[PDB]
């Protein structure tokens, strides 16, 4: 089992330097680059007593790449993998996909192919990006179209950071997401969304950290994407590979946007006073405010969800938990898929970063749950987009790049084509 | 990587630009001679974006100083960091403009543009890939207003896709240090509105008002005013000079702040601003700066923002801080004061942070805002232009230089159109 | 005083690249004023079919426009459509052929023919000009040395070009030699979707200054024949290199006037003509003392069915606008 | 718990420099401005190791402001908070409210709002002023009308110094009080009155100080207003917040004028000879001559009163004291609210100023008591006002400012509207 990762934009590298921070600590890999089969799916054997990571950090702006090259994890990452551009995308889907993308995609695609050639058990891919930015929206849309025609059959995990309802870092980020989603709909197998403000109240309420940064955020997101692939690394009573998440979450080929939520998230002093068990975590993840995406689940119905655990967790009490959750009438599962449960157990417990705010726990759980609760987000993104689209604001840059109102009109009606079938299956 | 060429047109351009190299050289740790003695290794990476490396660990800036009188070049050469500039960039004529836009744009300036255009060919070739031009001039007078806006058109003909950023200080009704301010201003904005993609409108009244309320300076000279405006020019170009959690290029602000090609006149501002007698009695936290950020008397323009509505604003913070409380603060200013923001945009605020603050300070920020309050400045100068133009007063000198009254009427057609453009989206 | 802007539609047969693919024939004609596309009518003044000839379109579209510009008022003509829509084939076409020509030579031929019918005392002064946009600069075709020109305003604040060449003609054969020099010197590219791809706006202005010596009454009428380019989709067209630079300029022009035509439709207070220089020369067409005629050329193929939908809503939105004539 | 104070006029700054003299001594704050949660309601944390007071000293005459700026507490107070005017009100309600007030209220109101923005637990306000002056009557009436329309819901403690029956500093002070009370009636939630001559016999009899100044007076008044807010600063067995005094003292919305009295007030040499206990202090405060307002309580009936104590005072003996006071027939509680008792205890004892005439005591008590004993004062103020109003004396200045006889006539009948309901509830 092997899988190749790729990080794009400012959002990717902060996830890159954070998510790879715990993988090298999980496998006992020192930061220098050296210390049997668990690390094979993310680290290769570099001759004798040395490793190299299976990732490519592409970015148009080199302001992050030189920081990593002058950082503490210099000897770990290969110097060729740290790809650099020439100039930033400027929050432009057009500039990051057409002008700046074409003159560098020929180098990135050849670099991905030569690394994929020596693979034998390449299960799929996982992409880290963000549609709200320029590089994460423009350049990621280019490679996803160009590699899908080449490989196609292999799976893909799009870990995209979405905009919040009221919180927003930029003003043109609806224009970046509305265009790229028109291309991401037909080629992306499954995209797990993340919201920026959804992390803010989590650490404020549960972790009681009142001045964290992205380094606290990405350490949590890096732990979330480590648990979903933890079955392939270490042994488990009920293992699940990368292809398992393609079938039990994507009932229709276009409805491929599951939510995500993770628990337990408890501080150091609070962990000892609270009892860690299977019951409360199985109830905590289904709590609506305990999600990584601020969307009301009660406004829709759940299609299917997977209960992947960690640590020494027996398989019986987890079955009693989901059985009790089925009896709770506060939630409501859809009649089209009532038995949408997928239990999973792993022996290797959650890790802990030295100095990190997250506390050590003997058991954990991660969740990917498909539901119709996301249609209100796309409805909200369409309504706010119509306010700017009517005045034709922030359009002269895109057509100044080469675009026009036609694809903008095709992107608007595509969400309208997505609104109808989310409401149809929600019945 | 993403180099910038500094141009300094007019008497104000040479002085405002001399302080720009003053303040950024301190945080970079550059000697007055030209060597490097900085304390952190992070300062050495992106030195190429404004300076050129030389032998003996020496560095020289890419400052294109241009003027028509030799007095400003001699004073800047004898400055604190006057010796660091290269002498060949100090191109200058003999006779001044005398506050005449026609002389420095058609007859007197055309003798000098051929000498400076070949200089930028050398500097544009020495860099790896130019990002944008950071020009500095003043609408008042003839040299910076006439010759400064001339090379804007010539460079745009060569580079029809690069960025052309300008920090233009405009006249004002109460502060009028020159009689030919409306005529020089009316002809300059005809070209700046069409050619340049970015413009930072600075007013001298706000620079006097900002130093009264909070700095409490009893004898502020021109050097004190230059420190305020120079910090804003440094704050905007800081993300591509030091690393940060979210680096915003100069063009990334252009895509976010310029919804239409002519609508690019920005409102500059700066924080923190506190006197030496009250620096100890103030909190440097993010809630304290954010309230002072969007204060009605904080920006560098005399126009009241309460008389208009912000179409888009930016706050590029600078220094180690938690971005969680930042986003709640930008959420509150747009929600609590939603009447002073356009309803046809969901979010009017841009965000950006940096890790290494300036020397002496811990956290800071810089404001850039495109609002409808600026139309009160463009119309009052138009009334000054219309009052004198209707009798053809002080136009016979322009006609001597080959000009015509039709171009003055055409400039008025551009003036009355752009103020109505702000009236549409208000 | 108030003349409604006419927006006439036209289709063509499928090109050689379309019939080889096998695109479906979507164009369904219902009457003459309206046309159905996927069960959606679009009311226009005149819908020209694919089998229409060049002369059949001319005598119905720009026949009465010759009377308007000669009476004393002004005329303004310009087409619109996506790539491979048949705009240049409608406007210029084949000049030397007896029937393959378009609108420009048929107009100027009728101007000289009409002048022969009237009395000799009506003295005319026909001056021609021709310039194309290239890298956001007004490139003059009659003079290759000039790469950029400046645009000014006249006495009543109507924009018009200054410094451009104005060759005073006296016979219609001279105009045929002039347009051949302009068409031959026109920078044309080659792409997968279109061979004779007109990737720039070509303006053909004719200032018709006439005077009657008996009554001593002076009259003038402008005549803009501006051929626009097509909105090239790079995914379908495969633009790269210098063709992308052509795409940046033409897409700004059609989108700039798209903001203007949408502003007049909804009834804006400002009407931002200042968005681009292409709108300045067309400011007299959309809000001046001239009759506007918008020829909506569109392709009946299903390969660009979404682009044709954008072009029809673009046309009907312009029908509601009225000039201040 | 936070509360913002404001001092107006000559009366306010003498209360300001005195009342803030003991607060910084209570929290161990040196006069320079530097030394965990008790000081938060009156002192903020200015970065690291520095404080700043939550007060605004507004005054038209800068003769007091430059003294404080050149005084000993220079490094403590913010220089921006020391607001200065241009010219004094001249004991004119009209000049301090309309002409001089409007050109400076725009700066003062914006200063109050920006300081209130960073607050989170702002309970209310407390105003220090005096209706017998010009700035304290005119400018205070302006801000109270202008902030009440803005905030409204928040509480307000008006600590106003009233004129005496026979003692008086000026001649126009009835005209200053009669006008401002018309505006203060409907917007002020509760106003605790203080009399100038009532302090004269207190220190003469009990403290036996035969030549004190205002510095001795305001040190006592500053101690009185420190005890009412002492429950919020330090912990207590029975705490009371700022909203407690608004309900249990103001039964009707217009009858919002409680009396005040304080005990024990014993000198240094007299403290060691006198036995400090709960019995005598609980009887001493109800003694009529021991009040801060010279008004006969026996001429009316008491509505309700609060017994807030200080220091190590057990809760049982205070209950026995109020029980014995209920049996004393020398007083008479009204039948409309017989159970008008509100006990309160605080652990932090009373402080002592170095060199002050007040002595250290292990227990103290402060009293606010609503009663009908104030109606004789308003009747007296109306009778003396009728002598000047009949002759139209001291009227040409007010109409010279812009006023007229209408508001003067409306101000006269307003007290007549206040005279009737005090007599009605007194039944
Ligand atoms: N913000 C600043 N404004 C300045 C400064 N110096 C001048 N000015 C303002 O710009 C106005 C005109 O600009 P200049 O001083 O450069 C006049 P110029 O040198 O272009 O012509 P001559 O000196 O007559 O050759 C001037 O009246 C001031 O209002 C300065 O250092 N900083
Ligand atoms: N949650 C989270 N989001 C991030 C992080 N870094 C970047 N982002 C996202 O990035 C968006 C801002 O645009 P960027 O992705 O930074 O764009 P860029 O890479 O700087 O390049 P330009 O778009 O051209 O300016 C925000 O909306 C964020 O959601 C991060 O560390 N954590
Ligand atoms: N009890 C007491 N009253 C004071 C004190 N200081 C001022 N006053 C009151 O102030 C009143 C006199 O008017 P001022 O407040 O001094 O008025 P001003 O601030 O001087 O301004 P003008 O009224 O315009 O003269 C007197 O009636 C006093 O009751 C003080 O320290 N203690
Ligand atoms: N009415 C028509 N009948 C038959 N063929 C036509 C017709 N119109 C166009 N064509 C064909 O189209 C080709 C020329 O393409 P043309 O120059 O018209 O592209 P275009 O649509 O004008 O491009 P643009 O939209 O950019 O102006 C010719 O080979 C011609 O055969």
Numbering used by the authors:
A (entry chain E), D (entry chain A): 2 to 36, 52 to 443
B (entry chain U): 1 to 426
C (entry chain k): 5 to 329
What did the study's authors say about this model?
The GTP bound to β-tubulin at the E-site (exchangeable) is hydrolysed within the microtubule assembly proceeding via longitudinal contacts with α-tubulin, while the GTP bound to α-tubulin at the N-site (non-exchangeable) plays a structural role and is never hydrolysed. We determined the cryo-EM maps of α1A/β2A, α1C/β2A, and α4A/β2A microtubules in the dominantly populated 14-protofilament type at the resolution range of 4.2 Å to 4.4 Å.
The microtubules were decorated with K 349(E236A) to aid in the identification of α- and β-tubulins in the reconstruction process through the “seam-search” protocol. We then built the corresponding atomic model for each of the maps, including the non-seam region and the seam region. Taken together, our data suggest that these α-tubulin isotypes do not show obvious lateral effects on their microtubule structures, while α1C/β2A and α4A/β2A microtubules exhibit slight longitudinal contraction between the interdimers in the seam region. Due to the longitudinally contracted divergence in the seam region, especially between α1A/β2A and α4A/β2A microtubules, we further compared the structures of α1A/β2A and α1C/β2A and those of α1A/β2A and α4A/β2A in the longitudinal orientation. In the present study, we assembled α1A/β2A and α1C/β2A microtubules, determined their cryo-EM structures, and found that they displayed similar structural features.
